[PDB]
């Protein structure tokens, strides 16, 4: 019904493209790139969208008198006329109106701290059906106005900016108060057998596509982290239910647990992750065996205490095993009597790290791919690579058991091959003594210096 501070939301707008509605959500990575963009969510049945970086938390909802009061120095329902502070779940930065552009438009993206007016947004009713001081209702079209620049949060042409043109937004709830201890969608977690479900380590002959039960240290590495993704956008953070279908996304690689005709149980690119290949559910038992709600729903599955059998929804097949303990994970008609898994929730530091490794690997791989492109040939995400490097250098800065996080964060990245990755950039740039752009070459010495600085920061201590 209503929205409250601390609810988690997405900011959705629509565009009409090829005479069909396309729904899109405000997204940003934060590290490596502060700028918002739009993540299409309409084709979810075929291609699951990247939702982790669309989630925002309603930190704060103030009257403007209450805002001006604070600027010159609790599950509150949101009222029209209030100013809101939206913290990005992944990066923990705040949604702001930036002071850069590309005329009258400002960039929208993420600000590293909630000081000043740029990260505040007033909410206005999009019809006479709502008035200042009334509660914002889940479902309401609304207008969002930057407190700092007085422009409207705006969809352009698909991009987002702050503009004098209005755009209608739906602030759609992802979740509200959940029952302590209960599994919800959007959680990052591990699945333990009796040893946990994972894909192999970086640079494996695997190509990282096969699934395993493995024990030992993997139980604390990023490669065994998974994100649960119900087949819905709104209330995708609701409590999970026995038999409810969901996709299971591998965090550091972005691939989706799947049944595949040629190869059996594997992990699959998002573009191949259609519903049937990719829907599993949790079952109480292997016996033969509703209508999805518009709230948190009944809590059903508990971290630690619940035993769960994972079933592939379209085939009915059971997640099981085949054969420094490492077993291959398979889908089978019968499985084994000890197939039930238990779930353990990841904590935020490690969860964040795993997403950062995903983006970083993507970015530097693309940057390596551009270098290979003109390697043989006399005649690149320079901006992002630089910011990414600068961001990681700050993240790895030495400090007071901050030394523990550091060592552990360094460890997560190292076990995901970030050292080779950084080394590969250095080796490829050092093929040159002093091809690319001349524009590109303006940034060469800066980037190699930043890489070496990162390298050192990944080993220090």
Beta bridge partners of 60: 85
**Cα 192 to the chain's mean position, in Å?**
23
3-state SS, residue 304: coil
The set of residues, in sequence order, having a beta carbon less than 8 Å from that of 285 and lying 6+ positions away, is: 309
Instruction: Return residue ranges of the chain for CATH 2.80.10.50.
Output: 1-176, 177-346
Question: What's domain 347-461's architecture?
Answer: Alpha Horseshoe (1.25)
Residue 280 and residue 248 in contact, taking contact as beta carbons nearer than 8 Å: yes
Instruction: Return residue ranges of the chain for CATH 1.25.10.30.
Output: 347-461
This PDB structure is determined at a resolution in Å of 2.5
Q: For residue 124, what are its two tokens?
A: 């206005």
Give dist(CA 334, CA 314) in Å, integer: 15
Q: What are phi and psi of 80, to 5 degrees?
A: -60, 140
Residue 358 and residue 414 in contact, taking contact as beta carbons nearer than 8 Å: no
Exposed, middle or buried by CB within 10 Å (0-12, 13-18, 19+), for 62?
A: buried
First CA to last CA across the chain, in angstroms?
Answer: 51
Residue 213 and residue 329 in contact, taking contact as beta carbons nearer than 8 Å: yes
Q: At what angle do helices 402-415 and 348-373 cross, to 10 degrees?
A: 40
CATH class (in words) of the domain with range 1-176:
mainly beta
Residue showing tokens 């000043």: 116
DSSP assignments along 240-271, one per residue = --TT--EEEEETTT--EEEEETTTEEEEE-GG
Exposed, middle or buried by CB within 10 Å (0-12, 13-18, 19+), for 461?
A: exposed
CATH class (in words) of the domain with range 177-346:
mainly beta
Give dist(CA 364, CA 424) in Å, integer: 9
Beta bridge partners of 266: 210, 258
Residue 241 and residue 183 in contact, taking contact as beta carbons nearer than 8 Å: no
């Amino acid at each position: 019904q209503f929205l409250r501070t601390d609810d988690e939301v997405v900011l959705q707008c629509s565009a009409t493209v090829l005479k069909e509605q396309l729904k899109l959500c405000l997204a940003a990575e934060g590290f490596g790139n502060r700028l918002c963009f739009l993540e299409p969510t309409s084709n979810a049945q075929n291609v699951p969208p990247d939702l982790a970086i669309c989630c925002f938390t309603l930190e704060q909802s103030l009257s403007v008198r209450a805002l001006q009061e604070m600027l010159a120095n609790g599950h509150r329902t949101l009222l029209y006329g209030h100013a809101i502070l939206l913290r990005h779940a992944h990066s923990r930065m705040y949604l702001s109106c930036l002071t850069t552009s590309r005329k009258l438009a400002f960039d929208v993206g993420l600000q590293e701290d909630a000081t000043g007016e740029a990260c505040w947004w007033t909410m206005h009713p999009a019809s006479k059906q709502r008035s200042e001081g009334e509660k914002v209702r889940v479902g309401d079209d609304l207008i969002l106005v930057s407190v700092s620049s007085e422009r409207y949060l705006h969809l352009s042409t698909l991009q987002v900016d702050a503009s004098f043109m209005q755009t209608l937004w739906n602030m759609n709830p992802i979740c509200s108060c959940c029952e302590e201890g209960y599994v919800t969608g959007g959680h990052v977690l591990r699945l333990f057998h009796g040893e946990c479900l994972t894909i192999s380590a970086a640079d494996s002959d695997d190509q990282r596509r096969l699934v395993y039960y493995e024990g030992g240290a993997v139980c604390t590495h990023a490669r065994s982290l998974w994100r649960l993704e119900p087949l819905r956008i709104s209330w995708s953070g609701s409590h999970l239910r026995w038999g409810q279908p969901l996709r299971i996304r591998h965090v550091t690689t972005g691939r989706y647990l799947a049944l595949t005709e040629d190869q059996g149980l594997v992990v699959v690119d998002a573009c191949k992750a259609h519903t049937k290949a990719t829907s599993f559910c949790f079952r109480v038992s292997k016996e033969k065996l509703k209508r999805d709600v518009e709230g948190m729903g009944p809590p059903e599955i508990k971290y630690g205490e619940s035993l769960c059998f994972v079933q592939h929804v379209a085939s009915g097949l059971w997640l099981t095993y085949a054969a420094v303990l490492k077993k291959k994970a398979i889908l089978h008609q019968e499985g084994h009597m000890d197939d039930a898994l238990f779930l353990t929730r990841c904590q935020q530091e490690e969860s964040q790290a795993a997403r950062m490794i995903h983006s970083t690997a993507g970015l530097y791989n693309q940057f390596i791919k551009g270098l290979d492109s003109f390697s043989g040939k006399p005649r690149l995400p320079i901006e992002a690579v630089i910011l990414s490097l600068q961001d990681l250098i700050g993240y790895f800065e030495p400090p007071q058991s901050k030394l523990r996080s550091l060592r552990n964060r360094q460890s997560l990245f190292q076990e995901e091959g970030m050292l080779s990755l950084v080394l590969n950039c250095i080796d490829r740039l050092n093929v040159y003594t002093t091809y690319a752009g001349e524009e590109a070459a303006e940034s060469w010495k800066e980037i190699v210096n930043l890489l070496y600085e990162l390298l050192a920061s990944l080993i220090r201590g």
